[PDB]
């Protein structure tokens, strides 16, 4: 960006934070802790909507356009520090970053694919499902320097593309021009500053449970900084805002090279139609529900029944919520007690392949281990595998040779019929799981 | 002037540096206050134990401290060494004096005092600890995990200039051997030290590694959050002062760790991380009014609101929730044999055995869940691990608390030492040439499926159950089947009060065994005691009386009916 | 060297000293006490006098046995003959040159829950050098010896039997063990040794204690 490029952003943007975006830096400035990283979360299209060029140059230079917006944030937290009548009551705070959320819906901007190579560079969306958490974490990320002939203290930065990593310069950034090339290192000698970002690595995958994702869906790596962190756990759906880099290591004597596309994270948010209002006037009731049972599935001879029932299955449900809090559920429950042979396996088959986000399993063949939760183990690390009760959480769980199952399988079914809910105590894992799903069973 | 200088600072002497005014500033404090402190004991163990709040007092011994509250949190490693240098410049002049007047009727070295501030305020809770925090000291209050073994640590080095003749203490980051790139002195830069291990100047002390997790509401703060942990490092007298269960108030520094570990997968290996440089550690070890004066049926039915039925198995919950009397005579060494009684649930599938163990460890303050299927030794047993330490498993995670085993009946050899914690309140550890016996004061609530599936047949508990003698004769309660505020109630009845039997419960108790009796274990009256002891603590009642034991009474009535049968 | 094997009571005299290695690129350092040796040597007072004189005889076994386990009733008998066992005893060597043993044997057939547990528990906890267990759950490989191995390494493990050597050691459930956990005590109540013979571990082990079972 130019200088009339930022200058435009910068003036678009104090205009509209010195218009509206008011009561979140006053409740900002009123926290106690001011050391802390507080969010500004801003609506990326309410805000491209009142000048043109500001979102050309977010879409061209995301990186320098969010530290310009943070400088901003900062002036217009003084500036709102400076209008009260008791400044003493509140305190202000110079870490103040800019979260992007609510992007323009285009496919080039939201996507639910792991980003490629084409879009290095880009600030987007990625929408998918936490398989991996790692722990919150502390260490450097600026070092200071000194000048050995003007004293001139001058600071350099880590570089994220090399994992966070230092190189030694050899100029001197000071205002006058010195031809020194020896600078010593002041990062380890004292403490006197405490600049250190937060850090934690996450990973994502494509929701298979997607019409877009296909059979083998794909992961990724996203970086979370600063207040970022401790904002998700693993199994949540996440829809991450941020900018597609590269990190990669070099190839040395014995050590090969390894790049890596991953997400250096800037926001986190947890998680025909003609015919069908024509299809809907006409049902609005006997004929429509022969039209659904014979369309539900029609290899099969007769039993209206069943297929009525099964239609009531992928119908509910719905949550409510008792007197006591209660969580009430919703999903429906059908149990097929026919005769080897007769079709009910073809029903529940083509049931899941029609449905999406659909789940199914034969009974024994798939023991509790994979019905509810696994602690998949490595060293002294862990985490979660989700079962076919759980996989099918807000979708159908289907379980031929239902009774072929112990009656351990069975008491693991019991709690997710009962509570939609499934008790983890395996190994060093335990925590309570929420699987709230239909079973269809034969 | 001062010596013991370079014990605490590694830079030169000079009066005008403005170190010189806090430590006369500390020193005054000291001198002041030299009568509420054991010298002998400072000397001994090489450290003193400040109150947060003398400091802050206000007034004229603290007239030359004024900011020691923000010079402290934001200034931790110099605030200690100028307060750590005045109380050994105010005990070295004290006994030069003392030297003195010996000597009349001078060489005293006293060691390096570690200046420890207890008491700390305000209190940070470690979920808001971040990385800005780096530098500062805080204060934490949390359960101990680990506990890892006594090492010997090497923080600071001598260094002899071989310019000048001047000898340095150049302290270690962490432990590394690093070289001086200069002289102390602002005079010349040699450049060029020799070590000098064996000298004074050159700290080795020992050093331990706990691990701390922080007190989470098992319910209210248990909505996706998981319980945070970190690390702290004992130094020298903190070394073997808590053990893994106590919950223990850690001041001190927080500090960049640096080791690291891992790896891997996939993956809990992080390189940035950080850590906490303990400075001082402090060991322990109205709605209630209306809810004393139905007692018994509302708590019973408030433990699980999502099981129907089962009355009588609540019911022991809640006993075993507060439990007896630890009668532990500390003057005499009597045992206190056990004042935590055990519950069995022996009953066919879809009952919700499951659900009455989760509903056991969540209104308990220290509940430990656990499956019957994925089963380790070290799961519930003590771990070992050498490179050794000792980490606490299920049997001992669940010390003063309770621990819920759910088909147990599924479990091997990774069970029979829950046998032994139950009579013992301690696990047996025998592994690599260590032996040892770790505590275990746990109560062990548990349930399994019968042998054949539906058994409302001619068979009895002993044989219906897939369960040997060898633990059917260990539990107090087996039941045969075929939030905040009542957590609050059970954790100020388990420290508030400590019940007693009376006579006329002992009475009740005398003429149901003779009735018992006259019909034809030990530990069948063992159970009334426990558990009338602990309906007496259940009603707030520092003595039982014969309505408990009835009640009590009629509960074992109905175990015993399920029974024999 | 070659002055002391595994298993040995030592009173090692000697310097301590401190052995290091510093931190390198990719190598992180460590730090070690040792002890250099020098010299290597394999191996109320008033009031005990006058227990001892009142004792000096009946009355005195009344006050030990009730002293012994008070929190039993009656038994007599069992708390005498723990407190031979407790006592027991000294070897002796005969004219083949045979160790004739010394430590006792007690063997308690009561019923469960009479309280014979409760006894050879405090038993233990009261008597310095003493060990424990509870049959099945402890095998063989709990009770005599177990070759603990490691690469082309190997060391002895002492069960039982031989953490008890001149101690006592409790077993309860004596009869729910299986016939070669007999068999391993059967050996360590006969010959106050048990042979090992595991992976490359072949050894002759001393066992002198006594076994008060139940
Ligand atoms: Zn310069
Ligand atoms: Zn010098």
Redo the contacts between chains.
Sequence with gaps: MNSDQVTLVGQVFESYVSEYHKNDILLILKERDEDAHYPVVVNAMTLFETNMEIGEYFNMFPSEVLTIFDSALRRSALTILQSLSQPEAVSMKQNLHARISGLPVCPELVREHIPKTKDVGHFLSVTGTVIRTSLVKVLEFERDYMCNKCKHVFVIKADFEQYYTFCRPSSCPSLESCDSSKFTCLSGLSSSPTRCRDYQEIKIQEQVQRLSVGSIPRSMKVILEDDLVDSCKSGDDLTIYGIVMQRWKPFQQDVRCEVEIVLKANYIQVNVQKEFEDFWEYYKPFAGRNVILASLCPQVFGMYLVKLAVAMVLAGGIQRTDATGTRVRGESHLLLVGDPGTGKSQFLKYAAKITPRSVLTTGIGSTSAGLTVTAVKDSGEWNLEAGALVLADAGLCCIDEFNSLKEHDRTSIHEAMEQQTISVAKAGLVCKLNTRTTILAA | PYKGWKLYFSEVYSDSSPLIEKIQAFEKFFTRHIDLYDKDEIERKGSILVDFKELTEGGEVTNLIPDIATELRDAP?KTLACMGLAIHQVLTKDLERHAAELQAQTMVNVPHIHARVYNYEPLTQL??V???????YIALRGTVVRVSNIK???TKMAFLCAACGEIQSFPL?D???SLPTKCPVPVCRGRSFTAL?SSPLTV?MDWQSIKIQELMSDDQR?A?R?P?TIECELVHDLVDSCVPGDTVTITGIVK?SN?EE?????????????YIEANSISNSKYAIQEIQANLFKLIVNSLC??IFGHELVKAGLALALFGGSQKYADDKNR?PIRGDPHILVVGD??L?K??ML?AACNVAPRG????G??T?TS?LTVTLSKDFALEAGALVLGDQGICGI??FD?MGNQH?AL??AME?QSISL?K??V?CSLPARTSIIAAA?PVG?HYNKAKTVSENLKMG??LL?RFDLVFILLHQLLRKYIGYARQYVYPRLSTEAARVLQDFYLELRKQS???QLESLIRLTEARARLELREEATKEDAEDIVEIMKYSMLGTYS
């Design positions: 490693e979920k808001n971040r990385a800005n925090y780096y530098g500062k010997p640590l090497c980051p432990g590394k051997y291990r080795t248990e996706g998981i945070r960049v080791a891992g790896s891997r997968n996939k993956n809990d290996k992080c390189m940035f991380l950080l609101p999502v045992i599938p879809g919700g499951s659900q989760q430990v869940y656990v499956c299927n994925t380790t799961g759910d088909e599924k029979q046998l032994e013992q025998a690599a040439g032996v499926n599936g003698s060898a004769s274990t030990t530990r």
